[PDB]
């Protein structure tokens, strides 16, 4: 009757006031929430941003990294003060149909992360081991077996290998950059908040910064990781009876939160940067996996005669397929975690962590193997670009289940009558919270819209257009209404 009833409450180690080492044992959880927001989907578009923006979009990363520190570390409260995750929490104050949409909801964000990694990692096998495109697809649905090998390690190690994973692809660019020597003083420059980004004058690759900065700050938080924070916050005891362990639990898991945030921060810095210094200017003209992996094994593509030899000997790009598997190895930790916590939450359903990964994995996998049917059907013409708009065209459900997670952890753990005048939200983040939130479901719904019309692809048909338009009003309307009357719930419980 509790989340994530294996694991809960399961090491606690507060020695006094022995920090550190306190700090060492349950630094797990942060890191396996700040895994996923190192995924691919959105590798491109930082490399982009930097060759369209050299280091002037690095302020917005803070930003968002900043604000998705703020939301998850509240998600970290309400599982650590109600010993409850998020979802329990919703599916507690409202009806079983809305507990139901959002369960379908989540299910579809964490199935687009999904297939990102699906898509990242059967490349990643289609670049190092040269296995053909179709079979890497299909290798990669074998990962319930690495779940398996993955059951009987324990939280202690698997914490710590999402770790390894996180110093994996952060190590693989950094090396690339270290050899790249950068203008370190214009990365500076870059970091702090300038007004540049705001505006809409330069206009590089059909991107202006006020595009691409808002861009960046409506894929601010990921649904999922909001519950699977909720969740993994509670696999440590605490006793609930004393106010000085418990709001010294929540500046433990603060500090991991953030400590782990600021690394996928790092990571996406370093994609950015990776953009302006390690690549010539405007040389990305694939945001593929594989454009990305010629124009790393291209010497003429980089600035530097070193990257050129190393390019040329073939460690940039194999390093970079190396990057694509570690971070398609997440969604099978990740997936199943959140995956549990939203179906026995929302519906109560409890599933074992077998048929969870095999029908998430199925239904990843067949848009893909559908995608490679056809663009190899075309003779495996624009098959790369083909699966890239895939994966950008299934992060439209994030937005669709992004207010629906955001506005009712807000709403909750503003409520005393969820977290008590103790613990609730100081004043600070009440405001800093509306704001963030008001801006991300704005920003969401706006994109649904672009998101829609980005199905058609980029051949604008006059009739299917005036269409994306009714279907686009009509998903936005029925996102409004369902915000509407979960707003009514929640604020009638509060």
């Known amino acids: 009757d509790l989340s994530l009833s294996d694991i809960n409450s399961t090491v606690e180690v507060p020695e006094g006031h022995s920090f550190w080492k306190t700090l ?50 509240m998600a970290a409260k309400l599982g650590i003060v109600c010993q409850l995750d998020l979802a329990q929490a ?34 990643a096998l ?29 939280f202690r190690k698997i914490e710590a290998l999402v770790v390894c994973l996180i ?26 908040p300038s007004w540049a980004s705001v505006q809409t004058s330069p206009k590089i690759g059909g991107q202006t910064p006020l595009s691409a900065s808002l861009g960046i700050i409506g894929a601010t938080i ?19 009876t004393d106010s000085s362990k418990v709001a010294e639990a929540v500046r433990f898991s603060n500090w991991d939160s953030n400590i782990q945030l600021s690394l996928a921060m790092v990571v996406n810095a370093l994609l950015l940067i990776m953009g302006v210094a390690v690549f010539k200017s405007g040389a990305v003209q694939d945001p593929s996996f594989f454009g990305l992996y010629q124009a790393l094994s291209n010497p003429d593509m980089v600035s530097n005669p070193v990257l050129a030899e190393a390019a040329r000997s073939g460690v940039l790009s194999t390093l970079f397929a190396v990057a694509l598997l570690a971070s398609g190895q ?3 930790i990740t997936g199943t ?12 359903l409890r599933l074992p962590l077998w048929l969870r990964r095999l029908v998430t994995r199925l239904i990843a996998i067949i848009p893909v193997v559908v995608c490679v049917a056809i663009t190899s059907h075309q003779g495996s013409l624009d098959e790369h670009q083909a699966l890239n708009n895939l994966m950008n065209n ?3 459900f994030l937005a669709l289940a992004l207010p629906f997670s955001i506005v009712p952890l807000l709403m909750l753990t503003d409520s005393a009558a969820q977290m008590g005048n103790q613990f609730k939200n100081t004043r600070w983040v009440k405001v800093m919270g509306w704001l963030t939130v008001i801006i991300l479901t704005l920003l969401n719904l706006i994109s649904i819209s672009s998101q829609i019309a980005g199905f058609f692809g980029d051949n604008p048909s006059s009739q299917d257009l005036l269409l994306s338009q009714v279907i686009s009003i009509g998903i936005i309307l029925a996102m409004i209404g369902l915000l509407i009357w979960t707003i009514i719930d929640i604020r009638r419980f509060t």
């Open 24 to 73: 060492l044992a349950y630094s797990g959880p942060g890191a396996l929430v700040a895994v996923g927001y190192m995924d691919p989907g959105n590798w491109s578009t930082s490399i982009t941003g930097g060759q369209n923006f050299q280091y002037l979009l690095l302020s917005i990363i803070v930003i968002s990294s900043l604000l998705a520190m703020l939301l998850q570390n």
């Open 90 to 123: 919703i599916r507690a104050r409202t009806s079983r149909r809305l507990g139901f949409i959002f369960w379908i909801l989540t299910e579809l964000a964490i199935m687009a992360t999904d297939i990102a990694a699906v898509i990242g990692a059967a490349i």
């Open 126 to 154: 289609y670049l190092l081991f040269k296995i053909p495109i179709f079979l890497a697809v299909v290798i990669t649905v074998l990962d319930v077996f690495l779940l398996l090998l993955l059951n009987r390690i324990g």
């Open 167 to 192: 110093f994996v692809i952060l190590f693989v660019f950094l090396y690339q950059i270290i050899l790249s020597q950068p203008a370190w003083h214009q990365v500076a420059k870059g970091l702090i």
């Open 222 to 240: 990921m649904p999922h990781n909001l519950f699977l924070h909720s969740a993994i916050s509670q696999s440590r005891k605490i006793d609930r």
């Open 330 to 332: 997440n969604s099978t």
């Open 337 to 348: 975690i959140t995956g549990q916590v939203i179906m026995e939450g929302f519906i109560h």
């Open 394 to 396: 299934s992060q439209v």
